Amino acid sequence: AAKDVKFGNDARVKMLRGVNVLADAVKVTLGPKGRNVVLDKSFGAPTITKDGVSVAREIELEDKFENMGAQMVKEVASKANDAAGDGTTTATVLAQAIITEGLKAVAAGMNPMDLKRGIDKAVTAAVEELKALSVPCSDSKAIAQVGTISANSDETVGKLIAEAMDKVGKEGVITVEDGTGLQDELDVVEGMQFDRGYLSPYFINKPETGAVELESPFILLADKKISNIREMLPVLEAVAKAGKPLLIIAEDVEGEALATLVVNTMRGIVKVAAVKAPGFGDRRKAMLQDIATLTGGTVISEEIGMELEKATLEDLGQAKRVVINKDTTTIIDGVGEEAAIQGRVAQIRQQIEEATSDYDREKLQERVAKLAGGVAVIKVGAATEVEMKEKKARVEDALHATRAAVEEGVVAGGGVALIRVASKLADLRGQNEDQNVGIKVALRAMEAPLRQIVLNCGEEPSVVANTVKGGDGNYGYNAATEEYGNMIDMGILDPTKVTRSALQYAASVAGLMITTECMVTDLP
C-alpha cells in the first residue's frame, strides 16, 4: 500500500523516542534493587517477570517509527539471550547509551560511518582487554557465588546448583522442572536410564514397590519387533541352562509372544522381562547401539544380515542389576569395555562439534551424559503458580550463568570490569577526528550499567561512579550493603562471556542504528 517517508532529524527523533520507551520499560529490572514488571497475557493470568528479554519481547508502540526503533532494539536482547542466556538488561542499557551519545554526536555534524568505525575499533580493543582481565573459575565456592549472584542474591539456589554440578561431574545434563512441594528438590540419576517400562504387569517379582528387579541378567538387543515365538526358542533354551535372568529390549512385543514369557516366569522356569527401545527412527538405533556398547553386547538387526535364530550367548550383554518400574527402567554397572565407551563418547563429541542446531546439540549432550556421566533434575517449589514461574526463571538464569562461568571465567561484577576496561583504553586513537569521537562515545557509554544500578538503588550515580573510578583493581560498590570494598571478597562475580557478548551485540546493533538517515513505513 501507500508509504510514509521522513528524512533526517524527524526520523532520528522518532526512532530515539521509540528506543527510549523500550529501554525505560526494560532497564528498571537491573541490579539487586530492581523491581518486577507485569506482562498481560490473553491466555491466562498476567505474569510477573524480572527478565530483560521477557519484558523486551512484548513492547510494541502505536507509532510506526517508534515501532521501528523498538523492533530494531529488541534484537540486542534476543541475541544476548540466545547466545549466553543471561545479561540482556545490561546489553539493552549499553545499546541505549551508545545510541543516545551517537545521535548527539551526529547532530553536531560528524560522519556517521566514521563514528561506527571508531565504535567498532573500541569494542574490538575492549573484548581483548576483557579476555586479559578474566580469571579462571574452578572451585565450587566460586560456582556457588556465581549462582547466588545470578539468582537475585539467593544463597540456596547457588548452593543447590553447585552441589548438582559436583554430583553430576564436568560432563552432564542439569535441567529444571516445576515441583509439587514448598521447597526445592534435587535428584540425580547415576547410570543409564530411559523412560520405557515393562510391557506386562505380571513380570513383577516384588509388589512391595511395584518394580521388576533382576540380578546379573542377560541383555538381548533386537531392532525388529517380536511377532512369533519362533525366533525366541534357541536363546531362551540356552539361557535356561544357565539360570541367569534375561531382559528383552525390542521395538515391540505382541500379546501372544509375551504370553509365553509371562507363563514361563510364573512356572519358575526362566525369569524374563520385556521393555521397548527408546526413541524413533535412527535415534532409536543410536540408543540401542549405545546400550550394546555399554553392556558389552551386540545388537541383532535384520538390516546388517544376521538373524535372531542365529543368536548365541556371545550376542547377549551383561549387567549387575536391572530395575524396571511402571514408567522407567535402569541398567547399573554395565560390563562393557571402557575403550569402546571412550570411542563412542569421542565420536559423538565430534558429531556435536559439527552440529549447529540447538535441539540436536541438546539431544546429543543428553546422550553423552546418559552413556557416561550423569543426569540431574532440579525441582523448584512454590505455593503459587506465578511464584513458581518466577522462581523457575531465576533458577534457569542461575544455571546458565554458572555454565558460562565454568566455560570461560569470572570478572568483577557490578559494572566494574567495563569501567576498568574503559579506563585502560584512554590512549586509543583512530584515523581522523570522527573515529576518535566514536571511540570516546563507546568509552563513555561503557559506564552505563553501574550508573543505572546505583540509580536503581537510590543514590547519586555520578559520585559513586567517580569514586569507583578513583580506585584500582577490584574496588567497587556493593549495592546490597551500600558500602565499598573488594568485589571478589564480597562474592559478586560476573562471567566474562556474558559481559563480552552483551558489549559486542549492543555495539553491533547501535553502530547500524546511528547511521540511519530516512525511514519508510506504511501509512497510519
Ligand X SMILES: Nc1ncnc2c1ncn2[C@@H]1O[C@H](COP(=O)(O)OP(=O)(O)O)[C@@H](O)[C@H]1O
Instruction: Provide the annotated binding site for ATP.
Output: 29-32, 50, 86-90, 414, 478-480, 494
Q: Which of residues 386-425 bind ligand BEF (CB under 6 A)?
A: 397
Q: With binding defined as CB under 6 A, does residue 51 bind ligand BEF?
A: yes
377 makes contact, choosing from Mg ion, K ion, a copy of itself, none, with CB < 5 to 8 Å by partner type, with none
* Minimum separation from the CB atom of position 302 to a copy of itself (A): 8
Q: Which of residues 439-468 bind K ion (CB under 5 A)?
A: none
CA dist 67 and 60 (Å) reads 6
Q: With binding defined as CB under 5 A, does residue 434 bind Mg ion?
A: no
Cell of 91: 546489553
CA angle 466, 469, 474 (to 5 degrees): 135
- Say which residues have a Cβ less than 8 Å from residue 349's Cβ, sequence separation at least 6: 368
**C-beta separation of 194 from 329 below 8 A:** yes
* Minimum separation from the CB atom of position 29 to K ion (A): 4
Q: With binding defined as CB under 5 A, does residue 396 bind Mg ion?
A: no
Binding mask 77-116 for K ion (x = CB under 5 A): ------------x---------------------------
Q: With binding defined as CB under 5 A, does residue 49 bind K ion?
A: no
CA dist 22 and 18 (Å) reads 6
DSSP string, 332-343: EEE---HHHHHH
61 makes contact, choosing from Mg ion, K ion, a copy of itself, none, with CB < 5 to 8 Å by partner type, with a copy of itself
Q: Give first-to-last CA distance, the chain, whole Å.
A: 11
Closest CB to K ion among 113 and 133?
113
CA dist 277 and 226 (Å) reads 12
Amino acid of residue 54 = S
> Residue 184: phi, psi to the nearest 5?
-65, 145
Q: With binding defined as CB under 6 A, does residue 147 bind ligand BEF?
A: no
Q: With binding defined as CB under 5 A, does residue 51 bind Mg ion?
A: no
Q: With binding defined as CB under 5 A, does residue 86 bind Mg ion?
A: yes
Torsion angle of C-alpha atoms 174, 156, 412, 451, degrees rounded to 10:
110
Closest CB to ligand BEF among 276 and 400?
400
Q: With CB under 6 A, what is the number of residues at the site for ligand X?
A: 22
Q: With binding defined as CB under 6 A, does residue 88 bind ligand BEF?
A: yes
The residues with which 377 forms a beta bridge, in sequence order, are 175, 187
| Burial per residue of 302-339, b for 16 or more beta-carbon CB atoms within 10 angstroms, e otherwise | eeeeeebeebeeebbbbbeebbbbeeebbbeebebeee
Cell of 196: 520405557
Q: With binding defined as CB under 6 A, does residue 89 bind ligand BEF?
A: yes
Q: Which of residues 384-443 bind ligand X (CB under 6 A)?
A: 413-415
Cell 529490572 found at: 29
494 makes contact, choosing from ligand BEF, K ion, ligand X, none, with CB < 5 to 8 Å by partner type, with ligand X
480 makes contact, choosing from Mg ion, ligand BEF, ligand X, none, with CB < 5 to 8 Å by partner type, with ligand X
Q: With binding defined as CB under 6 A, does residue 87 bind ligand BEF?
A: yes
Closest CB to ligand X among 29 and 365?
29
Q: With binding defined as CB under 6 A, does residue 52 bind ligand X?
A: yes
Cell of 446: 561503557
DSSP classification of residue 498? H
Given 193, 264, 478, 521, the residue binding ligand X (CB under 6 A): 478
Note the residues at the interface with Mg ion (CB under 5 A).
86, 397
Note the residues at the interface with ligand BEF (CB under 6 A).
51-53, 86-89, 397
